[PDB]
Structure formats: C-alpha cells, structure tokens
Amino acid sequence: KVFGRCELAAAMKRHGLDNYRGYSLGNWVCAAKFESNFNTQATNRNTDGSTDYGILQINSRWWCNDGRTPGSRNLCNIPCSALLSSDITASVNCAKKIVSDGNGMNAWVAWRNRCKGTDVQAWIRGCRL
Numbered sequence: 001k002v003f004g005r006c007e008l009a010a011a012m013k014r015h016g017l018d019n020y021r022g023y024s025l026g027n028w029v030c031a032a033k034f035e036s037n038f039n040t041q042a043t044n045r046n047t048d049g050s051t052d053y054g055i056l057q058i059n060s061r062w063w064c065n066d067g068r069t070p071g072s073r074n075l076c077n078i079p080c081s082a083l084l085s086s087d088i089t090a091s092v093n094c095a096k097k098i099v100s101d102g103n104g105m106n107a108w109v110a111w112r113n114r115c116k117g118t119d120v121q122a123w124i125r126g127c128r129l
C-alpha cells in the first residue's frame with residue numbers, strides 16, 4: 001500500500017508514534033517518506049546480505065527474520081514479510097523497539113541524512129490530526 005502523507009500521519013499517531021521516545025510525529029512521517037516513499041511493500045538489499053523491509057525499512061540482520069540473512073537476531077520476533085503489510089501495526093511496534101535501542105532515530109539513515117535538523121513539522125502540515 002502506498003499511503004498518503006496525512007493518511008500515514010494519522011495511522012502513526014493512532015499507533016502511538018507521536019512523541020514516542022521524544023520524536024514528534026513529523027520525524028516519523030519524514031523518515032517514512034525518505035526510507036520508503038510511503039510504500040509498505042518497499043524492499044532493498046544491503047551489502048552485508050540483509051534486506052530492509054517496509055515503510056520504515058527495517059533490517060533483517062537485527063530485527064526480523066527473512067530466512068536468508070547471516071547472523072540474524074529477529075529482535076522484533078516477526079517474519080520480515082509482516083513488515084510489508086498494508087496494516088502498519090507490526091512495523092510501528094518494531095520501530096518502537098528500534099528507536100528505544102540507544103541511538104534513537106539515527107538507526108534510520110534516511111532520517112539522519114534528510115530529516116534530522118530540518119523543519120520536520122512540515123510533514124504534518126495541512127493534516128487534520
């Protein structure tokens with residue numbers, strides 16, 4: 001599913017991401033924009049043999065099981081395919097664990113390089129939230 005911007009903002013907020021670990025909703029919407037272009041089905045292979053999955057590009061070396069990643073830990077205890085669903089529940093709940101792991105949102109490279117330090121509230125402007 002390709003979410004609309006405000007549609008994703010509302011779903012993220014309903015699932016408790018607004019201000020989760022101190023990161024405002026616009027941070028999460030910006031992250032999803034540049035990680036996946038709001039597409040739940042996005043997948044991208046990495047050099048270490050892992051793959052990133054879903055709207056927040058969650059990695060199969062640490063967080064989910066895809067059956068083909070050396071050194072897999074599956075800390076979210078889910079198949080990586082669960083992170084591709086139109087229902088973002090599993091991606092949100094796993095993202096909560098990731099962002100709590102110690103490095104905050106720096107775990108998302110696109111957030112670090114394209115959202116951190118910018119006017120992230122722009123990503124929720126116009127939305128009825």
Ligand SMILES: CCC[C@H](CC)C[C@H]1C[C@@H](CCS(=O)(=O)O[C@H](CC)CC[C@H](C)CC)C[C@@H](C)N1CC=O
Pocket residue numbers: 035044045046047048052056057058059061062098107108109110111
């Ligand atoms: C907390 C878990 C951290 C993980 C890493 C431990 C996730 C990292 C993987 C990184 C892979 C970097 S890589 O250059 O070595 O491999 C590929 C290059 C061929 C990347 C290919 C891209 C993805 C195709 C578009 C890139 C980053 C996008 N995600 C997290 C989300 O931001």
Ligand code: NA
Pocket residue numbers: 046047048049050
């Ligand atoms: Na890699």
